[PDB]
From Swiss-Prot, chains A, C:
One Gene Ontology term of the molecular function aspect: identical protein binding
Superkingdom per UniProt: Eukaryota
Post-translational modification, as annotated: The delta, brain-specific form differs from the zeta form in being phosphorylated. Phosphorylated on Ser-58 by PKA and protein kinase C delta type catalytic subunit in a sphingosine-dependent fashion. Phosphorylation on Ser-58 by PKA; disrupts homodimerization and heterodimerization with YHAE and TP53.
Lineage: Eukaryota, Metazoa, Chordata, Craniata, Vertebrata
Modified residues (N-acetylmethionine): 1
Oligomeric and partner information: Homodimer. Heterodimerizes with YWHAE. Homo- and heterodimerization is inhibited by phosphorylation on Ser-58. Interacts with FOXO4, NOXA1, SSH1 ARHGEF2, CDK16 and BSPRY. Interacts with WEE1 (C-terminal). Interacts with MLF1 (phosphorylated form); the interaction retains it in the cytoplasm. Interacts with BAX; the interaction occurs in the cytoplasm. Under stress conditions, MAPK8-mediated phosphorylation releases BAX to mitochondria. Interacts with TP53; the interaction enhances p53 transcriptional activity.
Gene3D superfamilies: 14-3-3 domain
Stated name of the protein: 14-3-3 protein zeta/delta
GO terms under biological process: angiogenesis; cellular response to glucose starvation; ERK1 and ERK2 cascade; establishment of Golgi localization; Golgi reassembly; lung development; negative regulation of innate immune response; negative regulation of protein localization to nucleus
Pfam families xrefs: 14-3-3
GO CC annotations, alphabetized: cytoplasm; cytosol; glutamatergic synapse; hippocampal mossy fiber to CA3 synapse; melanosome; nucleus
Cellular localisation: Cytoplasm; Melanosome
Keywords linked to the UniProt accession: Acetylation, Cytoplasm, Phosphoprotein
Length: 195, 7, 195, 7
C-alpha cells in the first residue's frame, strides 16, 4: 500500500484543485494505521470540507429555486445531490468514528467538532423521523467537544451556529478576550452582528 | 445563516 | 426526449455550478435537431469551456511539478487527466463537426473558432506524430474563421495566441479601432503588451 | 502565454 506516496498524492491533488481525488487520497490514508501527522490531519480536513462543501453549496441554491412540472425536475435534481452529499458525510463521518476519534491530545476535540459538523450537514439534509436522531447525534458529538476544549476557538463558533444559541456564542467568545485565532473570533462577533 | 471556518 | 426541459436542466446545472452535468445537458440538446437559440448556443459554449478548462488548468500545474520515483507518479497522474481532457474536446469537437458547424449566419465563425480552439487544446496535449496533424487541423479550422469574419473580435485573439503571431494580432486589432467588444481588445493589446 | 475569452 505505501502511505508516504499516497500522501504526496493527496497533496499533489490539491496543488491542482481536484478535491475528490484529494479527499479520496486521504481516505486511503486515514484507513491505514490512524494517528495523523498534524499536516496529514489537515489535508483530510480541508479536502473533505471542499468536496462536501461543493455539494452543500449547490444543495442550497436548488432547494430554493424549487419552492410546477419544472419543480419535480428540481426535486429530482436535489434528490441526486443530497445523495452524493450523504455519500460524503457518511463516507467520512464513518472514518472518524471508526479510525480517527479512537486514536488520539487536541485532535480529540478537532475530530469531535468535525464529527458533529458532518451530522449537522446531514441534519440540514434529512426529512423524515431520521432527522431527530441525526440532530441529537450531532449535539452529543459537539457538546462533547465544547466541554473537552475547556481550534477550540473554531469549535465554539460551529457549535454556536448549529443551534439556529447566541448565548453559547458570547460566552465562549467573551472569555477568549484575554493572527489565526483573531480571524475566527471576528466571525463569532459577526455572527451576533447577524443575530 | 452564519458559519463556520476555512483552510 | 423533450428538448425544452433538458435546456431548463442545462441552465439549472449552471445555476448551481455543476459544469459537467451542464456540459452534458447540452450534449443531449446539441445532439437533437441542431440550429441553437443564441442562448442555447451560449450555454453549451461556456459549460464546455469550464469543464475542459478545469482539466486544462490542472494539466498545466502538474506538467510543471513533474519536470525521481515521485515523478512517475506525476506522469501517471497527468496521463489520467490528459485523458478526461481528450475525452471532452473529442466529445465536443465531434458535436461541432457532426451537428453544429453544418446547420447555420454568424454562428459559422463562432463554431469554426471554437472548433480550432479545441484542437488547439488537444494540440497543447499531444506528443507523437499525432501532434502535427492536430495542429494543422486547428489552423485550417481557425484560418477558415479569420477569413469568414471578414465575436469575430474574440476570434482574432484566440487565433492570434494560437501561433505562439503578433503580426496577425495588431492587424485584426488595429482595424477594429474605428462595452463587450472593448474588453476583448484590451486583451489583445495586453497580449502584445506581453509579446 | 496569453488568451483568450470569457462568459
Amino acid at each position: 500500500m505505501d502511505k508516504n506516496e499516497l500522501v504526496q498524492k493527496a497533496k499533489l491533488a490539491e496543488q491542482a484543485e481536484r478535491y475528490d481525488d484529494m479527499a479520496a487520497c486521504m481516505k486511503s490514508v486515514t484507513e491505514q494505521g490512524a494517528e495523523l501527522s498534524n499536516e496529514e490531519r489537515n489535508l483530510l480536513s480541508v479536502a473533505y470540507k471542499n468536496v462536501v462543501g461543493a455539494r452543500r453549496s449547490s444543495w442550497r441554491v436548488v432547494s430554493s429555486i424549487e419552492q410546477e412540472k419544472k419543480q419535480q425536475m428540481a426535486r429530482e435534481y436535489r434528490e441526486k445531490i443530497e445523495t452524493e452529499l450523504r455519500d460524503i458525510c457518511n463516507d467520512v463521518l464513518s472514518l472518524l468514528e471508526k479510525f480517527l476519534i479512537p486514536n488520539a491530545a487536541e485532535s480529540k476535540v478537532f475530530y469531535l467538532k468535525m464529527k458533529g459538523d458532518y451530522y449537522r450537514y446531514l441534519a440540514e439534509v434529512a426529512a423524515g423521523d431520521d432527522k431527530k436522531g441525526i440532530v441529537d447525534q450531532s449535539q452529543q458529538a459537539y457538546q462533547e467537544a465544547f466541554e473537552i476544549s475547556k481550534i477550540r476557538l473554531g469549535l465554539a463558533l460551529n457549535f454556536s451556529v448549529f443551534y439556529y444559541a447566541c448565548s453559547l456564542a458570547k460566552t465562549a467568545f467573551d472569555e477568549a478576550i484575554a493572527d489565526d485565532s483573531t480571524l475566527i473570533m471576528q466571525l463569532l462577533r459577526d455572527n451576533l452582528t447577524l443575530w | 445563516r452564519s458559519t463556520s471556518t476555512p483552510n
